[PDB]
UniProtKB/Swiss-Prot annotation, chains A, B:
Single biological process term from Gene Ontology: steroid metabolic process
CDD domains, per the entry: ketosteroid_isomerase
Methyltransferase in keyword set: no
GO molecular function: steroid Delta-isomerase activity
Native species: Pseudomonas putida
Binding residues for substrate: 99
Subunit structure: Homodimer.
Transmembrane segments: none
Gene of this entry: ksi
Entry protein name: Steroid Delta-isomerase
Active site: 15 (proton donor), 39 (proton acceptor)
Amino acid sequence: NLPTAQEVQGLMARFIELVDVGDIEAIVQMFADDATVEDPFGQPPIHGREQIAAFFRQGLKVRACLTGPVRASHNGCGAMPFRVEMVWNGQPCALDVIDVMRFDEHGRIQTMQAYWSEVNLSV
Amino acid sequence: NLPTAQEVQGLMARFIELVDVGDIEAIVQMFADDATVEDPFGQPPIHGREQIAAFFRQGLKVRACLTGPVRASHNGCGAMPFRVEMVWNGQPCALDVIDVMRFDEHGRIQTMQAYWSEVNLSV
């Protein structure tokens, strides 16, 4: 059902766990079939599991960690701060991101928005 | 004008500075005249400077600090993690919050949403 504030915290922490190990099929499954993703926010969205799997395969030697608590509301929404560590062309970098997610009545991510730009990059 | 990613970081850091010292008139002025505020997200919004000043006077022995970098996009949007330390009825508490703000073409906060619930409270 529409996750409770407590459930949202758990689902969102799980999300970073999956991105960290790189289990693309498990990540993809966390999304609704017609979910949209806006990463980075400001860019046109990607819609549906096909495009989202492609999106995550493309991006995912990467590690991600929650750098603060997941902030959850009572209406199926949550926001969380985290860092991603990569190695861009031999050169290793870090990106500080904040994800805002809206879940559906099935506990699946209906919409996801990532806030970041080059100002949060450290390469 | 529509702030650049760099300007958004600066405006948002400024916001926490103002909340920390408790300068209500300066905070109020950071908002557009007809801005809406949703704090906590999930609650009906408050609209316009009058209601927002009332809102901030009501809430503001409080200290606030950025607990991570401000994530900014190129379309006048930003999100930031921070903590507020109060003392609720003699008993001192802390709230971890994430604010998402949209600015207008004047560099003023057009809309503000705060993500938090009792799961982020530590009293």
